[PDB]
Amino acid sequence: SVTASTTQGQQLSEEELERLEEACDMALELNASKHRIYEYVESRMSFIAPNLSIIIGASTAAKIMGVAGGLTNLSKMPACNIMLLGAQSVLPHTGYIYHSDIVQSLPPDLRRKAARLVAAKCTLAARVDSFHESTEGKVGYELKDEIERKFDKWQE
RNA sequence: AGCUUUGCGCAGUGGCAGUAUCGUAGCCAAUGAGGUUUAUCCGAGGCGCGAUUUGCUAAUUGAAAACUUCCCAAUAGCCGUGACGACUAGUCGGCAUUGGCAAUUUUUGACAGUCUCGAGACUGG
Structure with a gap:
């Protein structure tokens, strides 16, 4: 409001305002579409690979499940x-x-080692949900408590 | 039967030893330590804290450097002299101590160097 009192800016057209209006409307369409995809991928990835989704986050779990070629x-x-x-x-x-x-939730020099901590345990989680045991995700919860326990152990 | 591999133990020769050798009871670690190289690859301990027995010998200071001394008194050659003694003023033997013992015959150095085949020669300017 303070800098809209002193804008030094000229008004738009009607075509410019409607062009920006449909651009913002398709931007909200992209945002709501992104969040719809996020909700679906977290639901179906918590059904497909629950422990990996609990450790890493279900979107990154789906990414590393896909580029590797499945569970x-x-x-x-x-x-x-x-x-x-x-x-x-x-x-x-x-x-x-x-x-x-969860690997960027720490200082920049704390990063690389933390990758090796999240890569190993989620690998265990991946093996644990390659067979269909721990469907509730207790292995993921236990291993994720272990992950951020070590993260708090390294941090001050 | 011989050869031989790997791991461990013992002893020995040699080498190394504070960017070396360990302890760790604190934590983490093959359910992955730690990765800038080659990373759909490598694979072992890591971070902190804390360390760097025993016998023998030498040398120094110190009065004393840790295994059951100093001090006084006396005892442990010959020419003269004094007595005692012996033998005829003289001679001899032993004992004793109240002066002396580097000037040819002795005990305070004519010795030292050289040369020749047990024996001699040369020099000491």
Whole structure:
């Protein structure tokens, strides 16, 4: 309001205002579509791979389940490849679980090691939901408590 | 029967030893430590804290450097002299101590160097 009192800006057209209006309307369409996709992918990924979704987050769980080629290919991958799963001058030897929110929830030098912590345990989680045990996700909850317990252990 | 591999133990030669060797009871660690190289790859301990027995010998200071001393008194050659003694003023033997013992015959150095085949020669300017 303070800088709308002094804008130094000229008015738009009617075509310019309606062009910006439909641009903002399709932008809200893209935002609501993104959140609809997010809700569906978290629901169906908590059904398909509950423990991996609990550890990493179900969108990144779906990304590393897809680029590996499903759960039954994600299990028989080691922990040192699921770290680099989704890789490609921005950061090297990084996968989809380096740019996760739970691996960016810490200082920038605390990052790489944390990737190896989230890659290993979720690999266990991936193996745990390659067979259909722990459908409620208790292995994911226990391992995720272990993850952020180690994160709080490293932090001050 | 011989050869031989791997791990461990013992001893020995040699090498290394504070960017070395360990402890860790605190935490983490193959359910993955730690990764800038080659990363759909590698794979072992890591971070902190804390360390760096025993016998022998030398040397120094110190009065004393840790295994059951100092001090006084006396005892442990010959020419003269004094007595005692012996033998005829003289001689001899032993004992004793109240002066002396580097000037040719002795005990305060004619010795030292050299040369020749047990024996001699040369020099000491």
